[PDB]
Fold:
Amino acid sequence: YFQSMASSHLNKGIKQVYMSLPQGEKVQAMYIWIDGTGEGLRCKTRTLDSEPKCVEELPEWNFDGSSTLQSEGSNSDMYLVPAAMFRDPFRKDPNKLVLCEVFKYNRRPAETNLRHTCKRIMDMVSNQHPWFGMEQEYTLMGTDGHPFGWPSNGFPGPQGPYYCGVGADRAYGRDIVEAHYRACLYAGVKIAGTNAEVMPAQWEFQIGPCEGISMGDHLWVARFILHRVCEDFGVIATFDPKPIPGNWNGAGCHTNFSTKAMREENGLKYIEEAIEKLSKRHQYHIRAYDPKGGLDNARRLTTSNINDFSAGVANRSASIRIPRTVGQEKKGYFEDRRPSANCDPFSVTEALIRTCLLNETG
Amino acid sequence: LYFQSMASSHLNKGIKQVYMSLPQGEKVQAMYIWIDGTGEGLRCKTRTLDSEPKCVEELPEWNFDGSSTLQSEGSNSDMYLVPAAMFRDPFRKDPNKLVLCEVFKYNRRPAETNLRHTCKRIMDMVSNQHPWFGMEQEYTLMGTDGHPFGWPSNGFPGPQGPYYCGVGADRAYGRDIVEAHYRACLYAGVKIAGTNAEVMPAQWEFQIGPCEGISMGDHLWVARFILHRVCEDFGVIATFDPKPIPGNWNGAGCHTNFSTKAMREENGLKYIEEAIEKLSKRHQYHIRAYDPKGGLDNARRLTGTSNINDFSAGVANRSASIRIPRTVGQEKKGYFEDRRPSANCDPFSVTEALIRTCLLNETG
Amino acid sequence: YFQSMASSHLNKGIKQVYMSLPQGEKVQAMYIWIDGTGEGLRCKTRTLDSEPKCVEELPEWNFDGSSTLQSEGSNSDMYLVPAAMFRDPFRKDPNKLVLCEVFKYNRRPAETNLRHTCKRIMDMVSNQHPWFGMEQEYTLMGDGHPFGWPSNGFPGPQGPYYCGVGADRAYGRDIVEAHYRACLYAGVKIAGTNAEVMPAQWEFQIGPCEGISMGDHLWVARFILHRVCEDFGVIATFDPKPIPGNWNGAGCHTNFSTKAMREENGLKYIEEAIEKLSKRHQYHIRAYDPKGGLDNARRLTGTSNINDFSAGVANRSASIRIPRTVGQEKKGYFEDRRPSANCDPFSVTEALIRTCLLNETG
Amino acid sequence: LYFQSMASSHLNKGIKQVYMSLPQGEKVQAMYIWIDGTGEGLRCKTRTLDSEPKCVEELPEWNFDGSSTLQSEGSNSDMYLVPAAMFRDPFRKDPNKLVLCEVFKYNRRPAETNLRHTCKRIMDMVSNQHPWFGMEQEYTLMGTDGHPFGWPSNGFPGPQGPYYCGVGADRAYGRDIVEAHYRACLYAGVKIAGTNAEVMPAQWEFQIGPCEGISMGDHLWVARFILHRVCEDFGVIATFDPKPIPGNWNGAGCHTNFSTKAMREENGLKYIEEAIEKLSKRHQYHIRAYDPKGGLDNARRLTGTSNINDFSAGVANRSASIRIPRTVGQEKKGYFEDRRPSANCDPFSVTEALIRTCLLNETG
Amino acid sequence: YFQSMASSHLNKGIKQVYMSLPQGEKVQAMYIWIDGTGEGLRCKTRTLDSEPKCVEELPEWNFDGSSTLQSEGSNSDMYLVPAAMFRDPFRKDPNKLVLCEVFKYNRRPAETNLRHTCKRIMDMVSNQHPWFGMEQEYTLMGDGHPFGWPSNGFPGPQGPYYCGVGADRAYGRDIVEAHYRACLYAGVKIAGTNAEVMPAQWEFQIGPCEGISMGDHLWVARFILHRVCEDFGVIATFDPKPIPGNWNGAGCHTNFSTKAMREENGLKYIEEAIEKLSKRHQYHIRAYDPKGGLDNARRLTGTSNINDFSAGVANRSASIRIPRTVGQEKKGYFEDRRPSANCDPFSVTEALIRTCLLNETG
Ligand SMILES: Nc1ncnc2c1ncn2[C@@H]1O[C@H](COP(=O)(O)OP(=O)(O)O)[C@@H](O)[C@H]1O
Ligand SMILES: Nc1ncnc2c1ncn2[C@@H]1O[C@H](COP(=O)(O)OP(=O)(O)O)[C@@H](O)[C@H]1O
Ligand SMILES: Nc1ncnc2c1ncn2[C@@H]1O[C@H](COP(=O)(O)OP(=O)(O)O)[C@@H](O)[C@H]1O
Ligand SMILES: Nc1ncnc2c1ncn2[C@@H]1O[C@H](COP(=O)(O)OP(=O)(O)O)[C@@H](O)[C@H]1O
Ligand SMILES: Nc1ncnc2c1ncn2[C@@H]1O[C@H](COP(=O)(O)OP(=O)(O)O)[C@@H](O)[C@H]1O
Ligand SMILES: [Cl-]
Ligand SMILES: [Cl-]
Ligand SMILES: [Cl-]
Ligand SMILES: [Cl-]
Ligand SMILES: [Cl-]
Ligand SMILES: [Mn+2]
Ligand SMILES: [Mn+2]
Ligand SMILES: [Mn+2]
Ligand SMILES: [Mn+2]
Ligand SMILES: [Mn+2]
Ligand SMILES: [Mn+2]
Ligand SMILES: [Mn+2]
Ligand SMILES: [Mn+2]
Ligand SMILES: [Mn+2]
Ligand SMILES: [Mn+2]
Ligand SMILES: [Mn+2]
Ligand SMILES: [Mn+2]
Ligand SMILES: [Mn+2]
Ligand SMILES: [Mn+2]
Ligand SMILES: [Mn+2]
Ligand SMILES: [Mn+2]
Ligand SMILES: [Mn+2]
Ligand SMILES: [Mn+2]
Ligand SMILES: [Mn+2]
Ligand SMILES: [Mn+2]
Structure:
């Protein structure tokens, strides 16, 4: 598969003229789901008679699973169940985005529905109020399948000046980042921040703190919003953990994590206990942390090493880093730096709970 | 060697504007800004706040990865950001903020390129004398091929003469950047005093001032950030190099105007002339404070518009190290102009040197 | 010197977003003056604490005369004294444009400050209320070939372009429309516009303006035109003969009346003024361009020929024309058709007063 | 105003070469060349002959339309062409010929721009003194937009210095024209003595000489024709304007070297110095003979590389009106150099003036 | 100074038609000399009545030294004395190329005439028959970025380009092939070629050349390279470090033997010569580029470091290398790896003789 240039050269002002027409009483709801790859998002739209006040008043829907690698033509309809509702930043109020769970012909969860089991697990431990903060790293890619703004058939200068950089020779693609940030605020996604990363054309947004199942919900809708923003601009966002081989930064999805007890005074005690637990389960977490069970991360994890578990205060080379502020106040949260940028947050967050809170072993 | 990238400037800017039009809701963006391991480069990142801060004191401390800015090691990387000065964000609009910070190491001591820490102390020592500064930031707009903006491909425009304070498609190159920057600075609350085209084509200038004490450095550094961010939108680069094009093409400085309460009062020329006398004994100390390479950058500029090895002063003399403007000479009160600072100086280093020499009576 | 392409290829939509930010309580004042060439306009901007209500509230300023061929680097400061204030059409209310007179280090007028003596002369005859109306002709230039002309060649022969309409007749009307509106917003007394005979050649009229204000309004109208052309990436030339041969030249025809010429039977005093003009032709030719005649020498071939004085009613071939309506009604004004398009209006208007009203000879 | 046309240079030149390869048979082409009503422009046309002429005397008279060259009226238009000098045609190859002609009016008197007629008579008057001339034709290669060939679009290259006798993609602009012209002139039988790059980028030079008497003008004019025809194939223009680019860019001349039998014999410097003395009394007459506008063209060049109003001479002095080359000074025999002639002079006018002043002892 | 595009877009087929015309009996001689920079080559052409059979039949000539920074306009003539003649590869038989020595108005050598003293030194040791072999490294440049490199960026890291083959490794071989053939036709003693480590970087070797002929052949080989590059519209740079950082620098390594070093057990005299070299390192660094060391200072970081002298067998990190074969066979030559690519060979070869054979000190 290749990028297609034609759409980005369409006249965008014409579109804005149409989008300015007042739409009347009817409401658009764009249903969003995960396909048979476990990585690709799909969407379509229905008109509703009036504005829903919450996710619960959205009707069930369905799609053709024989066109998403999930079912067979002769018995095709698959189920969509509203999970999380947001305001649509592409169409504006009263219009909605709806992230859904997918079920089979028999009402059984689809194989790539990882939210179903994750929600049960989060319910088991809600008394401990688990909070997550995920740092989505990504690379903008241009037309030729080469990173956005890089020289054709070539490389820019060595890494160094791009991290948190400003100027036409440092920051590539800030228009995407700015529009995504604002789109997430309007939607009601819990976007905590942004920065430029170390590889040129590589960028980052943070989603959090989100309690339990809302983590995966917010991150998946944030990813959807990014791809749709990028589409408008004609560029591609990749969550590949090592888009360019060699001495060019990979992309992760660092997962920050705390429990009520970790956040309370001297909760550093419970942080260290959780890290201890994680230290005995490194390979299980590696298999949960990218969609190919570790094969994607093997291209990135030279930052920490893929075979080795480590932990330390302010150590950006360790598997797990305790932020310096957390080490100082003796409470807060810790950072798992192992998740690949293309991980599924429902898989990552469930594994943390199972290892750290439900004391599963193996 | 780093080149610019053309791609970002060819993105559809009307698309960005439609997204920037969405009402953002109750949350507020704060972009923290700081100086990196080179002492010249600016860095930034953004967090979301619960509500609008009413003053810099309400903003939280933060941190960053110093191993990615040439400031710390990867295994012990977190470095501190402590808010110093807050402005309105002209790129995102109210309720959003820009936050210039100081940088501190893992052990809470100031980073090597944190020159505001000692400068603020010095300004506190002399606050009763109310030191005011005005700085004239000269710069050159550069294109995409490392060649000045608007210049012929692989060549030169006509000789210097018509471009200074010039008007027209064949005189003024890049006024769009200038106009946008002036308005971005007024919206932000940066104390922008004025603008002009300079003598080299594609070279411009803005003045920041009069700023009391430590606010000079603050306002200057935020003004430079704004300029980099404006040029970024347009796909051009601003260089503060003191001699971007060798030969008979104008260099770039950061002329620093200065007065105390006593120099501003009637007959304060007496105190202006005393301060200039102290400066004449410390030429070389000021040259080492007046660019990031200790004089090496200015050596390409200060040829004879003063020579780098000779100290001079005179009324209305744009060839001297120090100029007394004619109006100050006539009125027998005001300020004087140090024309020595390189365009790429750090205002914290320049302001502090002037105070140490002229007011704290240091020698050597 | 050549035009630079690049600024016209900057994204003008970006600038407009920045200019839409509310500026607050500070005010920009752009000071404008004439340089050592006597034809070049220079400008720069200062921030003010509040909005001035008339010109006399604005402060004196100064500039580097060593960068404008007016003084030496070692003693470089030159004075700017505000003379006339307008509203700024480029930055809007409350921002101002301010035409200044230039003075030397010793407070004496600069060589190219012709306003100083002109104002004194206008004051000596205030009771006769001289009004002036000036017709500024100019050509829009691209590469410096006229704007819209074939690359390395020529459009069809003159005939259809005068007051013309259509893609094949009117070259550059965008400029003309923007300029007209900018002048109305500024408070410049713009009286009308038209397309002239040479393709890419256009005209605006400033007037009727009393005494010293003619020079002020016309100089500010010229600055407005250069700045408007700048935005569009084109150049305006007031050269009297930009293209040699059988292509129209460019004048600044100067219409002139006193209170007496305007009252009933004022034609008597018009004819009396033209009679005084007939004896002083070479004096006026030397006043009527910055090279003392050598510029007009390229235009005044036949149009009147440079060394020959003539007057007639409705005669567009004469040095002086009395318009048909003025002849019919026996009152009004007459037209001096001799001034080059690059004349200084201070110089032209002073010469008319000295000859026609102060009865000077030699 | 006339511009060049780009279309002809984009035609497929390999196609032309295939046709030019056909053996042409027994018939011969003769291209007649003459000077038009401006005194500067060359014109040509071609006839077919029955066989190859062995000398210019075997070529027939011809004629043309003088109403189309600014020389005669449409109702009585035929004008005469009388062969003066024959060369081999380097554009069509042997057996084909180039024929420089004199122009004569309907009444068989010489055209107003026929300056060879009187010049030939003068040369006959002094043939016993064997006047030899060598002329240094300077010229500038111009592009397609009236701007010098290779120069940046709407701009200037780096300052003069490296381009004189220069080598490299960033020094030598247009050497293809030069190399082709040199070979075209040798094939033709034009007495080409040498070439060099000049001080302005895109400016070159060739020498024609030593030519006795009237052959100087002949060989020079045919060399210029060859140069125009070569540049035409390549799509560039050669200008003989004495100052194509105003300011600190080199002008173009046609330095005229000159000797008689007596100046060439041992101790002939004595006769060189006598001739230079006669020239010093007639500076203004020679300036009026030395460009087609009587001095007006050279006024843009001769600024001070001699001033137009002052006569000077010196050994090895490239700032003087007349230079005695060092080798001539040393050897006490040879020639001297008149550096005054404009690149656009007519060699018939220059050579004749030198003879009239130096040998026929005319005054005024 | 910038390259000019236009000449490379001229129709080169047109030129070849003209160069195919039989020239007749006259002969072109192109005289070549070194200018006031000590690095720039200058040339011009005279017609001769017949073909010279050796250099001594060619006449003296002269040039304008005021246009080459060697003399003043009012006394401008400088002498050219033919030194070495070659066949002209650009114009063919019977046409010649002629390297000259330059002299002042008073017959004394020009400041940048280093051949004069070098020849005298070579004559003092003719019986020892010094041979030299020089390895000229250079980079092909476009806009001045290296030729074939990405616009505003960088090719992949060094490794595959050395002695490389393929569109993705060898940049500019057309030049190298044409140059090699032109040198063989000329009679220049070209010994070989290769692609070097930096992409667009190449090398030719001239030698073994006895005494003064080394400087002559290498200077003529450099002129041939500049003229060949000119045809192709590219530029050759002998700068020692054209691209900063981790991109190969450029030397002119100088191999050196006397008759004694070449006979059996000559290694003894090699080692003896290197010993004399070890005491005079700074002398040679000052001889070994035109800025007396300041150019080599950009290259001699580590390659040897500028202030440190070292020698070893097969050591490409040393100042002096004794090749492996020379060590094995106990006879031959040694390599001085210190000379910058922009050295004057007259200067280098003279220094070797003075130090190693005339036993000079200080
Ligand atoms: N108590 C907490 N529990 C879980 N996550 C948290 C907590 N406090 C903050 N976070 C989240 O941690 C994340 C930190 O991301 P970031 O600022 O990129 O840190 P760094 O770059 O230092 O790793 C943010 O998403 C934030 O919302
Ligand atoms: N009393 C003062 N002390 C310090 N600075 C001052 C004082 N008065 C004015 N200034 C500042 O001096 C600067 C003058 O800059 P500019 O107008 O570029 O002057 P010039 O170009 O004539 O050197 C402005 O920033 C202004 O705010
Ligand atoms: N009484 C008057 N005194 C001076 N100028 C006048 C008077 N009445 C009109 N004018 C001016 O004369 C000018 C006429 O210009 P225009 O319409 O171009 O005339 P035309 O093209 O017929 O010569 C206008 O500027 C107008 O304001
Ligand atoms: N005895 C002579 N009489 C006339 N001309 C001569 C004589 N000897 C040489 N010449 C000519 O003088 C010209 C010298 O031109 P050139 O080499 O450009 O000299 P420079 O550039 O030093 O002025 C050549 O045309 C040459 O043929
Ligand atoms: N006896 C010798 N004396 C001087 N130079 C020699 C001798 N033998 C060979 N050479 C020269 O030494 C040079 C070796 O260059 P090259 O093949 O590039 O070597 P390397 O790449 O191994 O250093 C060639 O110019 C060759 O002619
Ligand atoms: Cl849809
Ligand atoms: Cl950010
Ligand atoms: Cl301004
Ligand atoms: Cl023909
Ligand atoms: Cl040549
Ligand atoms: Mn982060
Ligand atoms: Mn990150
Ligand atoms: Mn990182
Ligand atoms: Mn992190
Ligand atoms: Mn200033
Ligand atoms: Mn300035
Ligand atoms: Mn200045
Ligand atoms: Mn200043
Ligand atoms: Mn009119
Ligand atoms: Mn008109
Ligand atoms: Mn008209
Ligand atoms: Mn009129
Ligand atoms: Mn010459
Ligand atoms: Mn010459
Ligand atoms: Mn010359
Ligand atoms: Mn000459
Ligand atoms: Mn080698
Ligand atoms: Mn090598
Ligand atoms: Mn090597
Ligand atoms: Mn080697």
Residues C 196-197 surround manganese (II) ion (ligand 21) (CB under 6 Å). The interface with chain E takes residues 150-157, 246 of chain A (CB under 8 Å). DSSP finds nine helices and 13 strands in chain A. The two ends of chain A are 39 Å apart (CA to CA).
